[PDB]
Amino acid sequence: TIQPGTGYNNGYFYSYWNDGHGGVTYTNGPGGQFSVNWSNSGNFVGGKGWQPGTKNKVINFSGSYNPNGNSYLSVFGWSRNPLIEYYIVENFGTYNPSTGATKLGEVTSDGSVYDIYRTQRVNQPSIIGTATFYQYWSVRRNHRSSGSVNTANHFNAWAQQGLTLGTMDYQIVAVEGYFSSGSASITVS
Ligand SMILES: O[C@@H]1[C@@H](O)[C@H](O[C@@H]2CO[C@@H](O[C@@H]3CO[C@@H](O)[C@H](O)[C@H]3O)[C@H](O)[C@H]2O)OC[C@H]1O
Numbered sequence: 001t002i003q004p005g006t007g008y009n010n011g012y013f014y015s016y017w018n019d020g021h022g023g024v025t026y027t028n029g030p031g032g033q034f035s036v037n038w039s040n041s042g043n044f045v046g047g048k049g050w051q052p053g054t055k056n057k058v059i060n061f062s063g064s065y066n067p068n069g070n071s072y073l074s075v076f077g078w079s080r081n082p083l084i085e086y087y088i089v090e091n092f093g094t095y096n097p098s099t100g101a102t103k104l105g106e107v108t109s110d111g112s113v114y115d116i117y118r119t120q121r122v123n124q125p126s127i128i129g130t131a132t133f134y135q136y137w138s139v140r141r142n143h144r145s146s147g148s149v150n151t152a153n154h155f156n157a158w159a160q161q162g163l164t165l166g167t168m169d170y171q172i173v174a175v176e177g178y179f180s181s182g183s184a185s186i187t188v189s
Pocket residue numbers: 015017045121124125126127128176
């Protein structure tokens with residue numbers, strides 16, 4: 001594993017965050033590759049990409065994703081002013097993150113329809129400290145662990161529906177888990 005934090009590796013930004021619970025290891029590999037191994041973890045997020053992201057980046061990902069429990073695989077990042085945590089969810093484990101959320105539209109992109117949602121986090125950790133903030137979601141109907149994501153299609157559809165983003169902070173392909181186990185090996189470009 002590596003130490004939780006951020007930085008650059010082989011030309012790609014990375015970010016590895018966890019809640020301190022234990023049970024998760026994160027490793028940086030050659031080029032845009034990263035691996036995650038977890039067993040009875042807490043909450044964590046790790047992956048490679050860019051800092052800052054952009055609003056029209058085409059992001060490619062390829063590899064294996066084997067969750068056992070609650071986990072997501074997504075194009076993931078933040079904006080500032082307004083503070084937003086966003087997800088383009090390509091696959092997940094036992095929990096669809098939009099469960100119970102209100103559907104705010106549809107967008108077709110990169111071989112699937114996606115459903116659009118907004119949720120809210122109350123007094124949770126963020127890139128600026130503990131805060132209350134909205135989250136934006138595009139959830140892919142046809143799950144996959146390789147593909148291409150045209151981020152502009154998502155950001156434009158969100159804006160059309162009233163979900164506007166601020167200035168872009170980091171933007172990565174992320175594996176997230178919440179009290180689960182699994183393994184993953186993903187290459188970004
Ligand atoms: O020490 C600071 C870190 O906490 C910070 O990193 C961010 C911490 O919050 C993470 O957010 C969670 C992502 O997963 C969701 O399910 C949770 O609800 C969020 O709270 C965020 O992804 C990390 O980047 O960075 C700055 C450090 O000073």
